[PDB]
Amino acid sequence: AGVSEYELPEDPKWEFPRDKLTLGKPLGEGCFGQVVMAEAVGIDKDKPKEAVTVAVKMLKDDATEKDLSDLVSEMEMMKMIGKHKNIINLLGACTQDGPLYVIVEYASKGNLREYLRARRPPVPEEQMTFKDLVSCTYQLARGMEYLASQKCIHRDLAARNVLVTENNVMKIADFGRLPVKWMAPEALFDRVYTHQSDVWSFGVLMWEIFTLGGSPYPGIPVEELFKLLKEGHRMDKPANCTNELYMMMRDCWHAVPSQRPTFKQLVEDLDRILTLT
């Protein structure tokens, strides 16, 4: 069944006391798995005696043996991936003697799509500015650079799967029923994911950011979306956008993958713009 009754879970140093954990509300519908806001204690290793809000990925009610094996493989992946500023990083675990919980960082601010829609100038309205936007895009690109470094692939790369903590710092999620609009022609037609497809997905994400939570390719049915893309139909420029950034977006949307801007090239360019705030 769910707990290890005939399973081989090793003992790591990552594991967190099954006791101090205490689960809470589940956040959103889990495309990557049922995740729950927990209130862990003494996992920072420097701030005991005070609760810290985290997210834990338990198993679903109709979980199968393969679901648990996939969860443990994903846990090991996270353990190998390493630490980066703008990524949902592993913080703890619950492996031996009980059900499997995977502790990942918690983001106070909701999804990026909802956060930007709620940070729109005259849904609440905390004033938002282009300077903050450019910082967001650069942070996301650096995170994606690191994520590509470990040769990982992003199932659904979109603002609907990017998070923000109380510190207003970007973090990726999903780096380990389909978003057709966020998929490159090569990936939408050959159904093969590649870094160039990740560049296209990142460019679509940038468009979603620049419009503060807009649906890409609005009014375009999915059936003819590929056909329109094949004829060289790329999205228009966002309203409150600059032409240089839009040209970077279109380059990320280049039909040929070879010429598309490398993830490092995008990070360099974004740093260049950020210096001119």
Ligand SMILES: *C[C@@H](C)C(=O)Nc1ccc(-c2c(-c3ccc(Oc4nccc(C)n4)c(F)c3)c3c(N)ncnc3n2C)cc1
């Ligand atoms: C599919 C779609 C409708 C959707 O809603 N996706 C979605 C669900 C939940 C959150 C989310 C998270 C969060 C927690 C854990 C993981 O697992 C993960 N993260 C990175 C890499 C890998 C391989 N797995 C998530 F992807 C997302 C979360 C957290 N940790 N804290 C606060 N709020 C949170 N939300 C809303 C995001 C998107």
